[PDB]
């Protein structure tokens with residue numbers, strides 16, 4: 091499909107057996123999801139943007155389905171205000187910018 | 190053009206007669222540029238990101254050319270980690286997400 095940018099590009103994702111709304115974010119290197127109790131091991135990490143840095147938990151090889159397109163990669167979990175789908179997963183679903 | 194996301198979607202912009210590099214950021218509502226001198230009046234404003242809020246200077250109806258495409262809109266200037274082109278201007282240049 092094609093998504094215009096009049097409004098926030100919010101889509102439904104599926105992760106860890108749960109449906110959520112997430113933002114398709116070409117300005118995000120990595121994927122950052124709201125607090126959730128995913129199973130398995132993780133590693134502490136800090137990511138920064140406007141306003142400073144936040145602490146997150148890095149989970150690897152997590153499967154996410156974005157609009158029916160599957161993707162496997164690293165997911166950061168922490169006190170983010172919004173679920174953010176970053177380039178590490180956007181590339182896997184064939185997402186491009188076009189103008 | 191069509192832009193893949195294996196690398197950061199960085200493009201050259203021209204604002205106030207000066208060339209800069211900026212990030213096409215579909216997760217940003219607004220356009221935020223690093224500290225710089227712009228002519229005309231400005232109003233102090235605040236915007237919030239992943240790590241909290243920052244103080245910016247709001248410039249309205251500013252000419253800005255993004256990868257050869259002209260836009261006239263709001264540009265925020267402040268201590269952002271990187272120049273980001275947000276949806277307010279991405280819509281003006283006809284930018285969409287596609288997968």
Ligand SMILES: CCOP(=O)(COc1ccc(C[C@H](NC(=O)O[C@H]2CO[C@H]3OCC[C@H]32)[C@H](O)CN(CC(C)C)S(=O)(=O)c2ccc(OC)cc2)cc1)OCC
Pocket residue numbers: 115116117118119120121122137138139140171172174176212214215216217218219220221236237238239240241242270271273275
């Ligand atoms: C009132 C303000 O609303 P809020 O609920 C913040 O809600 C957000 C936070 C972050 C994003 C993604 C980034 N957008 C954003 O900051 O937009 C700004 C500018 O326009 C406004 O619209 C949304 C918030 C303004 C951007 O797209 C990606 N960032 C990097 C970029 C700044 C270079 S990031 O989120 O900081 C990031 C993601 C993954 C990473 O992997 C290592 C690193 C960094 C969207 C909405 O309250 C704050 C306390």
